[PDB]
């Protein structure tokens with residue numbers, strides 16, 4: 001069948017994806033710019049990620065359409081329009097890794113996050129990552145390319161001029177670059193590192209919630225021990241274990257609650273050491289008033305904060321997993337082309353399906369934010385209502 005027919009479908013789908021990638025990710029950037037509740041270090045990487053996806057729509061998709069025609073081009077110019085998308089994919093990987101690491105720092109050392117992770121440091125990292133993405137993605141332009149061995153018969157058949165080639169991705173970009181350097185080293189290894197970071201994030205969150213409940217049970221258990229003690233020495237032991245636990249849970253109404261708690265433990269401890277068991281047990285019953293009015297609120301707020309961090313980490317992980325889902329088919333196909341030269345090449349329709357799938361990843365993140373992050377969803381609603389209605 002005439003090639004322009006299947007090419008028309010491919011091109012129309014690409015243009016549709018490009019429109020959606022621009023619109024959705026412009027909306028992401030507008031929301032962050034407008035809403036100070038969204039202006040944090042994590043979302044600066046989200047904006048860098050949205051900028052890469054905007055450029056997929058504006059530049060990479062037009063470049064992919066161009067390079068599908070096989071038009072006559074100087075080989076190194078053809079190389080640039082083949083490789084620019086690799087810059088954008090690489091920048092996306094760096095942003096996704098940064099988001100994972102940022103969330104790990106927030107859950108693992110929340111006390112030093114704000115001093116460690118600042119807007120100025122994020123902006124420098126983003127700048128550095130974009131420079132490295134150009135170096136990685138344009139590495140073929142530094143000589144790791146097939147321009148030294150042009151397909152002259154294909155070029156001559158298309159009427160190309162001297163020094164020109166038919167501009168086709170797999171004719172100019174070496175397959176060993178795409179598989180060993182781009183895929184294995186620059187894509188697969190960072191994604192696996194991300195998986196490891198996310199595993200540590202979720203394991204750290206689970207441990208911290210288990211520790212919260214352990215401290216709650218230990219507090220209530222030791223209260224029971226004091227109640228059914230029969231001498232002053234048993235009361236002292238439990239109060240001593242309670243006091244060390246109270247300080248462990250301590251590191252304004254929160255501070256007041258723990259100030260009461262430790263003080264009421266010291267009061268009961270002093271009576272215990274005078275051998276006044278009954279009087280000490282009565283002092284320890286006061287702890288329950290402090291536990292109800294203060295400690296349960298501290299426990300519940302800490303649990304709710306920790307669960308929100310789990311929720312934000314799952315949302316970030318969904319973004320990283322969707323990047324992998326959308327890009328792996330094209331990379332896997334390249335692996336078959338490279339590692340199985342006895343295999344027939346994947347057919348052209350599947351090539352174009354794998355290409356458009358990789359491009360759909362630039363559409364999907366705005367939907368994940370809308371469905372999973374209320375602050376985005378509310379800002380999206382207000383932008384659309386005012387500025388599109």
Ligand SMILES: CC(C)CCC[C@@H](C)[C@H]1CC[C@H]2[C@@H]3CC=C4C[C@@H](O)CC[C@]4(C)[C@H]3CC[C@]12C
Pocket residue numbers: 072073074076077078080081
């Ligand atoms: C700021 C943005 C919008 C600038 C966009 C510049 C783009 C469109 C330019 C910059 C470099 C250009 C390429 C440089 C060299 C050649 C070789 C020639 O034989 C065919 C055109 C081709 C392949 C050009 C296509 C267009 C190109 C990719």
Ligand SMILES: CC(C)CCC[C@@H](C)[C@H]1CC[C@H]2[C@@H]3CC=C4C[C@@H](O)CC[C@]4(C)[C@H]3CC[C@]12C
Pocket residue numbers: 324325328329330332333336343344345346347
């Ligand atoms: C990330 C998830 C969705 C995995 C994706 C699996 C895809 C990319 C795999 C599964 C089956 C694979 C195909 C199985 C057999 C062949 C025949 C060979 O002559 C060319 C490659 C080709 C056509 C493979 C291309 C890649 C392929 C389509």
Ligand SMILES: CC(C)CCC[C@@H](C)[C@H]1CC[C@H]2[C@@H]3CC=C4C[C@@H](O)CC[C@]4(C)[C@H]3CC[C@]12C
Pocket residue numbers: 328332335336339340
């Ligand atoms: C965590 C996961 C996604 C890692 C990625 C898996 C990749 C590296 C694996 C999965 C399936 C594999 C392919 C399965 C079958 C063949 C056919 C053989 O003749 C050459 C190797 C080749 C082409 C493999 C190359 C590597 C491959 C593409």
Ligand SMILES: CCn1c(=O)c2[nH]c(/N=N/c3ccc(OC)c(OC)c3)nc2n(CC)c1=O
Pocket residue numbers: 063064067068069082085168169170178330334348351355358
């Ligand atoms: C991820 C990088 N990447 C690739 O790895 C990649 N590989 C590839 N292969 N395309 C064809 C193969 C054979 C053909 O005919 C025989 C053909 O005819 C038009 C096209 N396009 C790719 N793109 C899109 C620009 C991309 O972006």
Ligand code: NA
Pocket residue numbers: 049052053088089092361362
């Ligand atoms: Na992207």
